[PDB]
Amino acid sequence: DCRISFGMNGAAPMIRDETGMMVPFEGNWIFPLALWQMNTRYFNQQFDA
Amino acid sequence: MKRIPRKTKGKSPATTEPGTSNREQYRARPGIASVQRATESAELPMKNNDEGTPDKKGNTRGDLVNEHSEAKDEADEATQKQAKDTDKSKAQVTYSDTGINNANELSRSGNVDNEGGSNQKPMSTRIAEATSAIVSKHPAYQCHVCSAVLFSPLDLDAHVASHGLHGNEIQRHITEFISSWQNHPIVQVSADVENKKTAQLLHADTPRLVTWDAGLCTSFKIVPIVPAQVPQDVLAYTFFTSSYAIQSPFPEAAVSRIVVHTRWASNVDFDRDSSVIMAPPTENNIHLFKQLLNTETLSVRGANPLMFRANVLHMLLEFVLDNLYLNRHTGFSQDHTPFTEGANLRSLPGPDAEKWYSIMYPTRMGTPNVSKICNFVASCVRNRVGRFDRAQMMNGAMSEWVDVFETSDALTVSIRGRWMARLARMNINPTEIEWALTECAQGYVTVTSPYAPSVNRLMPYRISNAERQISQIIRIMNIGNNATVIQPVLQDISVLLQRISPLQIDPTIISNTMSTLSPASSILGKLRPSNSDFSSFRVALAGWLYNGVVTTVIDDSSYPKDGGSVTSLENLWDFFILALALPLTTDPCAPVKAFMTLANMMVGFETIPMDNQIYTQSRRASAFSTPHTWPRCFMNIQLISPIDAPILRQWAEIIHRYWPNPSQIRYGAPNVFGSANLFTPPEVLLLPIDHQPANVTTPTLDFTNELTNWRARVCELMKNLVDNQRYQPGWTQSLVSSMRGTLDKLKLIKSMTPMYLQQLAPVELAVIAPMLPFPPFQVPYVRLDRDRVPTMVGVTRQSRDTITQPALSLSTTNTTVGVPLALDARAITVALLSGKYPPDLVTNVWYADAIYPMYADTEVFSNLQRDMITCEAVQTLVTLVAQISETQYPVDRYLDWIPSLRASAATAATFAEWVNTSMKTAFDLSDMLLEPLLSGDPRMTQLAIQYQQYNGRTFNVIPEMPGSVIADCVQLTAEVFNHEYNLFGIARGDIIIGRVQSTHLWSPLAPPPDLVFDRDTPGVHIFGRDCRISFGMNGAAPMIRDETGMMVPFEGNWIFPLALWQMNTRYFNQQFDAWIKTGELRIRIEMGAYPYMLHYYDPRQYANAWNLTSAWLEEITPTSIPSVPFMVPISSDHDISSAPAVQYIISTEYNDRSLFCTNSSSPQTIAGPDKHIPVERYNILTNPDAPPTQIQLPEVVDLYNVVTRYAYETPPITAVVMGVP
Amino acid sequence: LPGPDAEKWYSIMYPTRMGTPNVSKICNFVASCVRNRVGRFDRAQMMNG
Ligand SMILES: [Zn+2]
């Protein structure tokens, strides 16, 4: 169910947890390869930086 | 101002981001192109079916062909195009020469009218000839919101607008989709554009709901009838060295009247082009009341009274349609003119905005002189002008909405008020879209529609299921047994399905398993693996969706020649191929046929008992097409003797015990998109197969799978049959060994088709349904439950509380439940026998790639909007038509005083056609809408649809029709018409023809009491149809016959209903004229309502109106009746001499209401009609105790009120599709 | 009726349709007839269209 909600007015963008918690782009995450594969472009764009 | 052209004809610092590098190493599977083209053709809406309906002239369109013949020819046309679509000379799937005997089937043809007559001679021609016998003559970049990549900084601001973020994409965009796993965005644009550059299309014939008007919200304008210029004490305003001129709010002239002229001061983006323009009363407006049924007229000028109400109603309809706009908010200017000091006047767009102020705000002009105009201005309150209240929310320094005082008319305002509401109620918010699209996908992808916070983001797409049902009943009626209309839907879908499906059909599988009299070779030559056409398979599936209008069956040709016989090797194979394929047809009689087929071949070996002393055991199988033919021994196996017919008995048990079992599946998103399901629950999609959870690891030989088992069971049966060779003498060598293995090979063949048909197939169908242009229409699938088998589907037009002529819908002339479609048993079996998936299949990926491009071209949203109108249309129609014919529909009748005949079906029909086309051109529609309802007595009450079971029970579905803005508005304005009728060029009451020579100056439209008389007056004589006249002999006076039966002489006061004159124009003109002119005869013509025309004259000069009143009488006809001419005196602001005036026509009640003001620029009117600016009309200005928001409808139309003006955002639908692991 | 030169029939067909301005032997007859018995009287419409 992971999705991403863009940031606004300076706030940070956030991606959805697996329990439904929404975190900012920082810390230690765990991604099953498949999950990235099914979203390569969108992810590379949002996270690489 | 902007402008949207019509598609129809009208009434006329490093910035290099770390992840933006392209490594497009992905190739979609299925391919994007492939899927697009495919769905591109499914998108297409079914063809309009004019044939059978009437045109504006009243003549029905089409060719003069028998209903039965048309049905057949159309069938051929279809099956023949089916061929061209599959690039073959002979069609595999046919809509003609099916086993079914559809001998009673009827199609709409232009051979019949609305009264059940023959169009051998056109309706117009009949009407003409019919009246021609009654005539008489005179005697001798990058976006972190959605991740889309851009190239211009401007292209960014321009773009982000789609998310709500404002300018810190081209409106041409309607749909902006974007995938997350690949770089390939997809946007939809209107098909009417000229630059389909890499853009996808939105074909749907969508109506233009949102429209704007930056002009004035008024539909009445004040005009000068008789000019005038008078000397004044004050000539202008002066400031230091500057000097400004005096601009009045109203015309400065001797006489001014009000006139209807929709949007005379409007400034729009889109032109509904349905204007109602009237001319000043001094000119002829007769044309406004003869646009309709006044076709076969004997005079250019003059309308037909019996068609008055009919015409007037239509007019009111356009009056509404032409005003369906939203009021746009334009800017203002802070004014410092002494009289409107500090007010914020709204400035119209364009040049000379200050030119309009004078007209928008009466109070602006001071009170310079002593004139009727000023006396008014003096009366108004200063404080109510300009901006009154504004929104708290704002973008930039501009408010999102505002309330302002300004010239306008309560009616028009009130209308746009409701139009507003209606749309607003249809609002949706992206979050809802997320849920909808996501749910539709059955969980293979997930949509995300980002957006910023806003309340003025209008997205009208939500409606009630009821509405969708009503709408789809219209669709079902459109088909009308014309294969041509369906042919495409079915085909075009089977294609989509083909390239969206991971299943592949590879006959070689059969070839490799057989490895080769030879039973082995026979079956091969019978199947023909080399042939790669499988339309029958795909179509077969598409059929499961429209099982209520189309019924698939196996072509009679697929059965055994001459019945067949278990002794012929070839026939046994026919049986196989057949039995194996029947289950995929919607034909509710498949089972029985699957049984009888073998029973046929068994003749001479086994025998079953027949219940009928007529039909034998040889009755060809393909003939058991309906439920009443199911043989008793088929429903009660117990009746088949295991001694007399051992095999048939098993075949029977096998059918009962193993024939597939129907089931259902959820589909679509019923909470946002609603559902057009009619006979089934909203979220259900019926299937004639059992469905299971998807799982590619599934075994090929899973006898748990209903279909796989059938394959088996049918094989082992044959085996048993062929084992002892008791059923095949004349077979020289033992073929058991071979015949067996051959069957064994088929039984155990590793086809994955059944697997697919039970796991993926169902999903795919569900993933489509919602996006389809013609939503599913099913009727329950019951297997062997005979009593519950459906056999008829019909539509009804009248309400349940009435007994009318039973007019069954053509839909019911089909032997089956629907139009027969024939499929090829061979093809289907082969397909079932040789399917396989790609070895590297991965559902999660495959379907993701299959949905993205397909959903990105979705037209759901637009179809929803249409469904909304389609309903409003129907609703409106019944409301109107019911006011000119005798229907039992409950509605307030406000215009019953306007004469009208009792419309016949034929008459009503043509009326409808206008009510029809007017709506289409108003909403820029170019396709169907109501057409189907105009095929026979449209004098309806309510739509409803139903189907019956073999046991006689029926299911009736009557959608709960909700409100209708259009309908109500028409009625609202009609309610107002009942008072402001003069403003529309219509006069109420009767008239009185009679000489009146005097010098007085009263208006003939407002006569003095003792010049008018009525039925309940002394010494009056009333007349009827029997008004025989007798000539005077030898000096005696001629005499006409009373209503009492008395012969009276040509003098006194009579009462004639208009009709009389019309029936005897020539004779009466001859006998009476002389008496009326110089004698003492005065006639009151009863009319009810009538158009009038004014002739102003100089009071101080002789004037004799005989000429006009003569010509009026002269030109009356059994059909026409020119505008009544009145001769009125020109009012004057000063003493004048008097002079005789001879009149002959006066009204019988006040009708000078359109009179706005006399000598407006002068201090007072000395002679003639004196009228002062109608204070009532300017209530919120002339009455201090009145709240700003008060209206006086429906008795008085205020010409100045509070108007709410908005500014909304209409963004495209954005969707970011993500994949699932 | 079919065929050209038909306008003639509509007057021989229905006498109750004529106007009655005269005191002519004809008008007298016409004038004394019941109005409502002319034209279509009743029908059996089974199939819509
Ligand atoms: Zn974006």
Swiss-Prot record, chain B:
Its cofactor is Mg(2+); Mn(2+). Its EC number is 3.6.4.13. Residues 91-122 have a biased composition (Polar residues). It is found in: Virion. Residues 1-122 are annotated as: Disordered. Gene3D superfamilies: Inner capsid protein lambda-1. A zinc finger (C2H2-type) spans 141-163. Its main location: virion. Pfam families: Lamba1_VP3 (PF22033). It is an enzyme of class 3 (hydrolase). GO terms for biological process: 7-methylguanosine mRNA capping. GO terms for molecular function: ATP binding; ATP hydrolysis activity; RNA helicase activity; zinc ion binding. InterPro entries: Lamba1_VP3, Lambda-1/VP3_sf, Znf_C2H2_type. It catalyses: ATP + H2O = ADP + phosphate + H(+). Keywords: ATP-binding, Capsid protein, Helicase, Hydrolase, Inner capsid protein, Metal-binding, mRNA capping, mRNA processing, Nucleotide-binding, T=2 icosahedral capsid protein, Virion, Zinc, Zinc-finger. PROSITE patterns: ZINC_FINGER_C2H2_1. Residues 48-90 have a biased composition (Basic and acidic residues). It comes from the Viruses. Inner capsid protein that self-assembles to form an icosahedral capsid with a T=2 symmetry, which consists of 120 copies of VP2, with channels at each of its five-fold vertices. This capsid constitutes the innermost concentric layer of the viral mature particle. Homodecamer; each decamer is made up of two conformers of VP2, called VP2A and VP2B. 12 homodecamers assemble to form an icosahedral capsid. Interacts with protein mu-NS; in viral inclusions. Belongs to the orthoreovirus lambda-1 protein family. This is Inner capsid protein lambda-1. The lineage of its organism: Viruses, Riboviria, Orthornavirae, Duplornaviricota, Resentoviricetes.
